[PDB]
Amino acid sequence: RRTYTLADYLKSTIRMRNYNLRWISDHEYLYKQENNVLLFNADHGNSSTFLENSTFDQFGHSISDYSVSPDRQFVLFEYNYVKKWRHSYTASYDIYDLNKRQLITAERIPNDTQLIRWSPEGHKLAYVWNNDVYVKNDPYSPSQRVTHDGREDAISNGITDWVYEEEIFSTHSALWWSPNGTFLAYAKFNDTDVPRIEYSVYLDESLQYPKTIHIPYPKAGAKNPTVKLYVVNTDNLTDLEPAQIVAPASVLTGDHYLCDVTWATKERISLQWLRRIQNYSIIDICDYNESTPKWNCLVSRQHIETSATGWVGRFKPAEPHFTSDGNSFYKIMSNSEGYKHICLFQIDKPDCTFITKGAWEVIGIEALTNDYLYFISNEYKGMPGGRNLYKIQLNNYANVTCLSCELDPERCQYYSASFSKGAKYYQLRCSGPQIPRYSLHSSSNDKELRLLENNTALYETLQNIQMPRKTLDFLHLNGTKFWYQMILPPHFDKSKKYPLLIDVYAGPCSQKADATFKLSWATYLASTENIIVASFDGRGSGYQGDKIMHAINRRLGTFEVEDQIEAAKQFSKMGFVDDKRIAIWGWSYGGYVTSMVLGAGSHVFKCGIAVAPVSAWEFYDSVYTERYMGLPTPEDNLDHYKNSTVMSRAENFKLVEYLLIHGTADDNVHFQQSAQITRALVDAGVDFQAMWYTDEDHGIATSTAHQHIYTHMTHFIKQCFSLP
Amino acid sequence: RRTYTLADYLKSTIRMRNYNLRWISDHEYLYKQENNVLLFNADHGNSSTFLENSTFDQFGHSISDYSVSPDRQFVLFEYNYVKKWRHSYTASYDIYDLNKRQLITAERIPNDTQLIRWSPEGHKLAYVWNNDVYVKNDPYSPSQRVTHDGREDAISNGITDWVYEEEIFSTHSALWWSPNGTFLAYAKFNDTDVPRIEYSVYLDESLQYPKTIHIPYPKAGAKNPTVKLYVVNTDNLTDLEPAQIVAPASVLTGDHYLCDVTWATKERISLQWLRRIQNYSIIDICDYNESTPKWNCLVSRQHIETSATGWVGRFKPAEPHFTSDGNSFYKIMSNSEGYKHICLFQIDKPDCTFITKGAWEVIGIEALTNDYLYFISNEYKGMPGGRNLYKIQLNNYANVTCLSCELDPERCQYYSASFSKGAKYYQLRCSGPQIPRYSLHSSSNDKELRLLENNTALYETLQNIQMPRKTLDFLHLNGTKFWYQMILPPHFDKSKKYPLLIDVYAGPCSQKADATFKLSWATYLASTENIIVASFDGRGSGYQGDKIMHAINRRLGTFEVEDQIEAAKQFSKMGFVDDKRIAIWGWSYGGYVTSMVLGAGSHVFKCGIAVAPVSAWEFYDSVYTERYMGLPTPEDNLDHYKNSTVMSRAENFKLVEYLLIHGTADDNVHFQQSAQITRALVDAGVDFQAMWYTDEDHGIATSTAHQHIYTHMTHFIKQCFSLP
């Protein structure tokens, strides 16, 4: 029987399908099929061809994306897509009028447009061009320029800078339409005094001279960009200047962040602010006073969230989900025991009321109606690495009803959901630990309407392959239960002793051990090279309580490192793991941990790989770093900024085999970091291996580069484990 | 018996001494001994302490170097040394009076001084600070400012830019005093429109953001800097200005280089100009007029040098060696048979007379007397790799007497000399093949006056070691003699079979197969690991004829590559070479040839190492590249610029093991060149090994890095050669 070879991983020979849809109603969604865009109605099961693939290639050129207007009158076509960063880009957009079924030729959308978003209702447009905000009341209507200070690397209106897109918003967008489309809320960023990172780009062999790329990148303690929030009335845009909503006073004592903007009603806006010392968060509720007319942000509806053991939220404070009347909201907060649970806020009330509790966390709030609230939790079977859909009755909080627990309990233990408007229907997505699945459900009776994708083709293709097995198990460290996972080789024999390879992230609020089904590189090693690939969620991990999560606070590189070693020591006690063939590798925080582990002097690991590793917290951006480590000042936390460098551990690298990989175009984890490591390894008489990948970004993902780094790492591990 | 250990190379426990001296008279020379500067009198032989080691330490700073005035009244002390580039720096200077045993504190020399030069007679000073020339007729005097348009990276007066420093002048100085100290000639460079290479420098772990380093670097085809030559009357300057000496019309038809400036008499100057297409140079003899025009350059005394087969000279045209009257000069030129020989030029007459001939070349003219001319050639036994001192009676060209050939014909075959003023005495300098030896001679009888350094302790300390033996042999390629060297392991047994390591430079006018004595890394591989290390000098090599050397013209990366292969194949046919264990490595042109050899698909070499290689001549500087490859224009030589890249040979790297090393702060061979290779090797799916060295220049020389790179390369060889 065939095995999962390396070519099977790198060539995507074994494709896993999914089912991605866009709810455009309370009962209709769009789905792309055979390059056609089909419009499905879940209330009747009937579906029409909404957008022929004929009218996708008959424009002049290849179209990259689409976005249909909420009134289904116009379609945006995106083409000439040029990648900027993780979530950012610039492209040209066309407008396709569906009433005439004709392409719009006048009042077009300029080339090099950065952002674009429809209004929630109707057909109004807002786009960002040369870092300025423009609005179009109609595709057949001239643009209205809102801002005029758009300066590259200085001022951005409506689009995020680098740190916000990466570490806060997780999207390039800084436009927020009002539900009626009357108001637009946009953010203005100012990176004028933010220091710049500079790295060279060695483009095609034609380029005689390299390019120098500049990016405003505040490192730990550096000058941070400012943000201001302005609101604009689209219906009477030529009456007043954009109205700034000043941040609350609580956050104005120094530098601060803007982390979320949500619309409660057609005339009420909510702003989540965050201090720079990220243990203080506040929600401001602002109503439109049509008199002056200003935005009236009453103090009595300010809502504070703090943390005594560290920072607020998991990565950033939870976003509020307002009720249909915008006079209350539900947001996730840590209870007294330190577990993320759902709390009920009244806009005018100073306290919140918890509606869920237990020794388990709530992952997120998925949908909200007047009678039920839908959410995801890791409560089922007390397994933190699982995800299941629940619903809460808003009259009797004791009446919690899991919607995914008993559907296929052996095959599916990791669910997610995508709801429609008003939570009439919801798409269920199972991710593991067996073959994924996608189904359509109706919230009225929670019955499966139809099976969207079963991956049956995947199922039979794996039947002919000696696939490895994934075990979800746990262990105890100083009396605390800690979960881990093992990818076991096929025909696993506990009497025989296998080599061990540890996959690390160990990042704050990370979770590497979970009931998810992946066709990864580890799948190759176990199925073919018969290597046990493990991952251990120790201290600093998430979804297990603020006790375990905040243990790493202000002490990065201390406990998440020891516990990877200590768990590795536990694995040796088992009778099926070779003591002399234990390895480790990571990526962008594992590479930090993997490096910091090999420098611990543990005599546990034989070799290691660090891919785009962090080497010192002095080098990473302030938003992620200062959240867990604070400021590098002698008065705040400068001590452990220095005590936690990989370079301080060079001498102990004489005992292991180090392989260091890093891409040169890395805008996230700068090549400066790996360079500082090698200088410490060189200056210490330590021999090691290295490999750069030219013009590859942080997540090395170019087809040629993705295949090369893993084919390189396979040779390394096989040489370290003395494998064929 | 012990062997030459790797630690013996990297730690230099087994030191080799040398005798370095500064002739300050016709019979006196300065010599440093235990940090004391001693004055020696060659005539009788006695000695006296000229400068105590109390100094260099009694002043508040460690003194790097010293320089004594010709009239022996003042001494310069160099401190605050900050290395700029290869031959450049910037440092601070203190002036010390000898008649008063005092340190001058009035009218001091500024810090951050970029150059300093004494007049050849008297004690006139000339230093360059902020790219402007300042002059002092006496150390106790103010500094008259000559130029005022100095600007960083834009204009340089008196100091070279990068390309002139590296590829023409081999010095940072662009000052030329007249013999009487009356005139000062200085050149002015303009890099205003020359593109700037940029690379990042990752300083100490405490240095948060990296520093971008800009350097005016004209790559092949780019805009070269302009150069103008001015002369100043130092005696009466407050009245007069500098006087420009315009280049000949022969050279003003385009871009041109200034390659030499020599003072014939107190009022006569010789300028060597060079066309950008380096097959046309001219010497200009310019006389001083007591009225305007300040400098009268007669047309009838222009002297022009051309080459129809390639470029002019070896690296640059030979410099002229004037007679005492300045009415004639000897210089090295190619004859009709293509052999560099000495020619006698007469200023006014347009032809020259060869005073030497034969199928061998002259290396350099060492000294000129009114009766004899001393020079260095490779005539003895027809060995190009040997150097000996000869002398010609300037009356009887037939009386050509060797002064070193038959001293120790078994120990010494690679001589050089450092003559005194007027050539009364000359230090003989033997460099191999056996242990070096330094002796002092008298010109009147060529009789050894005394033995300066015999390296006796080095002789004894070597007999404790199984030291290798180096053979200088030759082979015929297509009926053309080609020489090679073989470092042979001790106790050589031609019945056995040895691994083969081919050290490659193979650059134009290069010589890797000589009769010199080096304690190198090749010694370790032969003494300890029993590896034969060979070096072959094929087509493109110098000192053998312009037929052999200019065969590389406009065809770089073609013939010097193939010849290395076939010589290795001829090494394969030998009975003592393991065909399956042949490897090759090189540095900075060898890395180019090594990479180009491994890409040829010859199945000859098993593995290879390329350290700081050239990947594409499009990326190297113009002065070097255009000299041998022409212009990368579709009309001149664009094609073999394209055809000669390493990246075009990526596929054939699947058959060899490849290790690529490069310094991140390399300004000579930019990191871009290595990065372009890996991208082609990544795009071809070829696995290889790489290793960067942060902030290491082209000649990776940091004490820590130098050990790490040779240690890293040894592991690669042993693994490739299947050794312990």
Ligand SMILES: *[C@@H]1O[C@H](CO)[C@@H](O[C@@H]2O[C@H](CO)[C@@H](O[C@@H]3O[C@H](CO)[C@@H](O)[C@H](O)[C@@H]3O)[C@H](O)[C@H]2NC(C)=O)[C@H](O)[C@H]1NC(C)=O
């Ligand atoms: C974007 O940010 C930059 C810098 O973060 C802002 O410009 C800077 O504004 C400050 C004051 O806010 C200026 O500093 C000093 O102001 C005092 C006032 O007494 C004055 O006396 C000093 O001479 C000095 O100017 C600073 O000069 C200025 N820097 C600039 C203009 O480069 C800028 O206003 C921000 N823009 C937006 C749209 O947010």
Ligand SMILES: *[C@@H]1O[C@H](CO)[C@@H](O[C@@H]2O[C@H](CO)[C@@H](O[C@@H]3O[C@H](CO)[C@@H](O)[C@H](O)[C@@H]3O)[C@H](O)[C@H]2NC(C)=O)[C@H](O)[C@H]1NC(C)=O
């Ligand atoms: C150092 O080199 C720079 C760049 O070559 C010199 O400045 C440049 O001079 C040229 C003229 O040779 C200017 O080009 C154009 O000339 C035409 C002639 O009609 C004129 O119409 C244009 O308006 C322009 O002047 C060029 O602008 C100028 N570039 C600058 C000043 O940045 C410079 O003179 C050289 N310096 C020395 C000391 O030799």
Ligand SMILES: *[C@@H]1O[C@H](CO)[C@@H](O[C@@H]2O[C@H](CO)[C@@H](O)[C@H](O)[C@H]2NC(C)=O)[C@H](O)[C@H]1NC(C)=O
């Ligand atoms: C969208 O909502 C806004 C605010 O609710 C509407 O604006 C107000 O509309 C009311 C009546 O609905 C008027 O009495 C006010 O004079 C309006 N004030 C402002 C500032 O607009 C807006 O008309 C609504 N638009 C649509 C298309 O529903």
Ligand SMILES: *[C@@H]1O[C@H](CO)[C@@H](O[C@@H]2O[C@H](CO)[C@@H](O)[C@H](O)[C@H]2NC(C)=O)[C@H](O)[C@H]1NC(C)=O
């Ligand atoms: C948020 O964290 C900061 C520092 O991490 C806390 O600042 C402390 O403030 C008190 C004043 O009440 C000082 O006495 C301490 O010295 C401060 N600590 C440091 C390390 O500077 C702040 O109290 C925290 N906020 C909350 C609400 O817990």
Ligand SMILES: *[C@@H]1O[C@H](CO)[C@@H](O[C@@H]2O[C@H](CO)[C@@H](O)[C@H](O)[C@H]2NC(C)=O)[C@H](O)[C@H]1NC(C)=O
């Ligand atoms: C959807 O795919 C699953 C596989 O994940 C199918 O379930 C298997 O069906 C076979 C029948 O031959 C049983 O023997 C297996 O035990 C089942 N496995 C699991 C994990 O349930 C299922 O039949 C497919 N459904 C459809 C409609 O095709």
Ligand SMILES: *[C@@H]1O[C@H](CO)[C@@H](O[C@@H]2O[C@H](CO)[C@@H](O)[C@H](O)[C@H]2NC(C)=O)[C@H](O)[C@H]1NC(C)=O
């Ligand atoms: C060492 O060489 C020096 C060279 O300067 C000799 O210098 C002598 O200096 C005295 C001083 O009055 C003169 O009178 C002599 O004429 C110099 N000698 C010569 C040869 O010129 C010095 O003599 C030498 N050493 C000794 C011990 O005499």
Ligand SMILES: *[C@@H]1O[C@H](CO)[C@@H](O[C@@H]2O[C@H](CO)[C@@H](O)[C@H](O)[C@H]2NC(C)=O)[C@H](O)[C@H]1NC(C)=O
């Ligand atoms: C150095 O040489 C220069 C030129 O050879 C001398 O300058 C000339 O000196 C003579 C007589 O002293 C004058 O008639 C000329 O007018 C001078 N010409 C110039 C250009 O200066 C100079 O005097 C000599 N100085 C020394 C110290 O030897």
Ligand SMILES: *[C@@H]1O[C@H](CO)[C@@H](O[C@@H]2O[C@H](CO)[C@@H](O)[C@H](O)[C@H]2NC(C)=O)[C@H](O)[C@H]1NC(C)=O
């Ligand atoms: C110096 O080199 C150039 C370039 O190789 C030579 O220019 C050639 O000249 C001949 C005759 O004028 C032309 O037919 C060629 O087309 C020229 N080649 C180029 C590339 O322009 C020039 O002749 C050489 N100089 C000497 C003295 O031989």
Ligand SMILES: *[C@@H]1O[C@H](CO)[C@@H](O[C@@H]2O[C@H](CO)[C@@H](O)[C@H](O)[C@H]2NC(C)=O)[C@H](O)[C@H]1NC(C)=O
């Ligand atoms: C100078 O050094 C050379 C070699 O470095 C010495 O020459 C050797 O001398 C020994 C006698 O002890 C002979 O056995 C060797 O055959 C000699 N070798 C050569 C190449 O000649 C020489 O003795 C040293 N001279 C002094 C004065 O120390």
Ligand SMILES: *[C@@H]1O[C@H](CO)[C@@H](O)[C@H](O)[C@H]1NC(C)=O
């Ligand atoms: C376009 O859609 C039709 C609908 O069946 C399908 O047959 C055809 O293959 C599609 N073409 C492309 C290029 O996707």
Ligand SMILES: *[C@@H]1O[C@H](CO)[C@@H](O)[C@H](O)[C@H]1NC(C)=O
């Ligand atoms: C489904 O049927 C209803 C009623 O028959 C119709 O109004 C609707 O348009 C149909 N769906 C589509 C996508 O046309």
Ligand SMILES: *[C@@H]1O[C@H](CO)[C@@H](O)[C@H](O)[C@H]1NC(C)=O
């Ligand atoms: C200085 O010179 C004296 C005289 O020979 C010598 O004894 C001493 O060791 C020297 N000191 C240094 C530091 O070179």
